[PDB]
Design a protein around this ligand. Sequence first.
Ligand code: HEM
Ligand code: HEM
Ligand SMILES: N=C(Nc1cccc(CCc2cccc(NC(=N)c3cccs3)c2)c1)c1cccs1
Ligand SMILES: N=C(Nc1cccc(CCc2cccc(NC(=N)c3cccs3)c2)c1)c1cccs1
Ligand SMILES: C[C@H](O)[C@H](O)[C@H]1CNc2nc(N)[nH]c(=O)c2N1
Ligand SMILES: C[C@H](O)[C@H](O)[C@H]1CNc2nc(N)[nH]c(=O)c2N1
Ligand SMILES: [Cl-]
Ligand SMILES: [Cl-]
Lengths: 362, 362
Amino acid sequence: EEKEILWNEAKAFIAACYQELGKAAEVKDRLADIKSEIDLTGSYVHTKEELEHGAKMAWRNSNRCIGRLFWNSLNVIDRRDVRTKEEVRDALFHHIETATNNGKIRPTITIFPPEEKGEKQVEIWNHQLIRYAGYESDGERIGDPASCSLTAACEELGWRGERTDFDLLPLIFRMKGDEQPVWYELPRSLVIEVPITHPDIEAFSDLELKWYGVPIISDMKLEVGGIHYNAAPFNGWYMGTEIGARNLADEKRYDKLKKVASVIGIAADYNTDLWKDQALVELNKAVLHSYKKQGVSIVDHHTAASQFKRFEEQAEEAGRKLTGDWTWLIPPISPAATHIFHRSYDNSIVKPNYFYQDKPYE
Amino acid sequence: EEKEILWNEAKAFIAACYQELGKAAEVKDRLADIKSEIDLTGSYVHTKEELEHGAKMAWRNSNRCIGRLFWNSLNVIDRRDVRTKEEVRDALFHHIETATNNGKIRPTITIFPPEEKGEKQVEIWNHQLIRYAGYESDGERIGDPASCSLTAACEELGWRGERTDFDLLPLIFRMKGDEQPVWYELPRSLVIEVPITHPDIEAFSDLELKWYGVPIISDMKLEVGGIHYNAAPFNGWYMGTEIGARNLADEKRYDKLKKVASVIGIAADYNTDLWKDQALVELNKAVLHSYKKQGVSIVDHHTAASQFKRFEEQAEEAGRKLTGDWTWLIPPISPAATHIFHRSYDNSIVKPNYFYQDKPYE
Ligand code: HEM
Ligand code: HEM
Ligand SMILES: N=C(Nc1cccc(CCc2cccc(NC(=N)c3cccs3)c2)c1)c1cccs1
Ligand SMILES: N=C(Nc1cccc(CCc2cccc(NC(=N)c3cccs3)c2)c1)c1cccs1
Ligand SMILES: C[C@H](O)[C@H](O)[C@H]1CNc2nc(N)[nH]c(=O)c2N1
Ligand SMILES: C[C@H](O)[C@H](O)[C@H]1CNc2nc(N)[nH]c(=O)c2N1
Ligand SMILES: [Cl-]
Ligand SMILES: [Cl-]
């Protein structure tokens, strides 16, 4: 059934991809080639054009993504040639640098060799390439709780963090044929960070908050025409609410709302004062102001929803069915102030797409 | 199939209802009685106890309701005896008065005679018993746009509104055997209203906002054991966000955010200033403060979500499956600050329940 699955997905992908690229005539022969290559090799190899367009289609089909208007501008880096952990490490380093682009973030994806027979060539352990460590001893929480398990595995392997609230985790990945992963400290010169200040409340700096510039998701599988790229880290820029309404706000993350309330001079005693709501607003204002001030790309949730509406309009104009996950598309603050909240979306899964895969640790 | 549908629902309802009431022994005989009554009459009549508990179960099963912790305290008024439009009008008047209770709102439902053979005895046209009119001539919007069609039908029938932004619509309903509905102006002494002021921004009163005290949904069908009560208006108290984040905020409702922004002294020019979010917070603070100050029951969304968590815990303890509609349960502001946002809910429909029915006008 496996060869048959591959061949079926390959058939559907190549037709659609070539159709979009005005290459419909070449479909018959390319599929012949693929059909034989599968017969022989047990798989097939995408052309540079198929791989690039496949990665773009996968972003366009990601139901949970509000940022999909810019799907066609994705910068696709082909690293199917890597064989060594040095080459992987350097490809990751390069990704960070070229995506960051001095703060003018470029949506980029780096594609590593695909799974062979469900056998990984490269297995990335990081959730994001740049992320903060999290610790818990004796009921003292330090850093990012979401990083607790990964941080414990890293320290198992000889890494030690300084136990600030913002320790950068090392890149950590395993190669086919190694029983253990390697880890490399991130060069500080590579990682842009943004201190969080408020446009008019000077005391906000007393919180000593910061966040990293570029979110680079490194644990999802890209699937294109039956080929499974388990290692294909990708990045855009942040929507401000991801940092201000979730990473820094959630009780199980940095849990900063009470501290925000105090520095902005409001009581955090009564539900009916809406102190959490007010704190959320000022913190989210701070995040947007801080990124724009430092010259690091970011989008607020209103602008992002406006862009997404254009995505919807563009999909209809191109004759493509639109798919989306309403529960992920609405922003975590003022969602009813966006058009997204007031309509419905078909949550069907269309391929190519990005998918979750099991963590190698835990 | 219809008698069979009735008998099947009646079988399921009576068993469950009597079980909850510790009356399991009486199930066999009561169902015998019902079985024969259906055979004869084409239907059956609930006992006072069945009707009351049925109305309570229906609230408990309403997936979209965050206020369900208090389901068992529902005040059920049995008005299956009404035959005249005078009796209907007075029952509606009475509902408003006893639910309002000088501001200490009592969750109440008034139950009118059920449909016979899908034939309505009483057909209520109002969406809520207390609601504001909406007008549109020559591109001037006046009042509540959501009331536009109903307002047009009322004026068709001889009613005329003063065309303030807050005209109270008349009660309007039709009786079986009348071709037209009647309408009765609401006695002002019956309707509590709350002027919207802000705890520390005095200028907020310049907006001259107000809202009514008690939301009384009068267009849904209550279904209990196969009997269809198309006319059964019910009320709780407001969650503050329904007024501050939707009724007064939505572009297609009162659309007040820009005006709020101005009176609280912030620019409404840049998305990245989060002026809409800030306006939402201050307006919602105003709504809660104004109701509590006047002594009219209201709940903020945080307290409401805390109560709902208790509802979930109580359901599990009673061995009842919990059902809910995630997209309706999350509040329209700071939803990620409630536990609701971070879990999932089974959206199955269980009966008894409240259901939508087609409007008689439009
Ligand atoms: C260009 C700027 C972009 C913005 C502002 C943006 C915004 C977002 C946001 C806010 C989410 C929700 C994440 C969460 O709540 O944790 C999301 C999800 C997602 N985005 Fe984007 N995105 C962008 C670019 C991209 C790119 C370049 C890709 C891939 C090529 C992508 C693929 C996805 C996927 C797969 C998800 C869902 C992940 C999951 O299910 O866990 N996005 N996006
Ligand atoms: C006691 C105070 C109550 C509060 C605070 C409350 C809160 C809410 C809220 C906020 C909604 C969402 C409405 C919207 O977004 O427009 C809702 C929906 C609902 N509530 Fe409640 N509720 C209460 C009592 C009741 C009662 C007494 C009943 C019936 C006996 C009821 C049945 C429902 C139903 C059926 C819906 C959904 C209606 C629809 O689908 O359109 N609730 N409730
Ligand atoms: N702005 C962003 N935000 C963003 C975009 C996509 C995903 C995410 C993180 C979403 C998320 C949140 C919580 C858990 C997970 N992962 C899982 N639930 C997993 C299950 C199994 C392995 S991981 C993913 C954040 C971007 C990053 C990269 C491109 S855009
Ligand atoms: N706090 C409340 N809020 C509340 C509770 C239930 C319902 C509502 C209104 C929900 C709503 C909003 C928009 C449209 C509709 N109705 C429809 N979509 C219809 C379809 C067909 C006929 S009406 C209902 C508001 C309460 C009122 C009564 C008891 S609690
Ligand atoms: C289409 C979309 O589901 C719709 O706008 C819903 C969203 N969730 C909601 N939630 C509540 N409480 N009330 C509403 O009117 C709506 N509208
Ligand atoms: C259970 C629930 O669906 C879950 O918490 C979702 C809700 N919607 C979300 N939406 C976004 N954008 N990001 C998230 O992490 C979540 N979490
Ligand atoms: Cl993140
Ligand atoms: Cl309302």
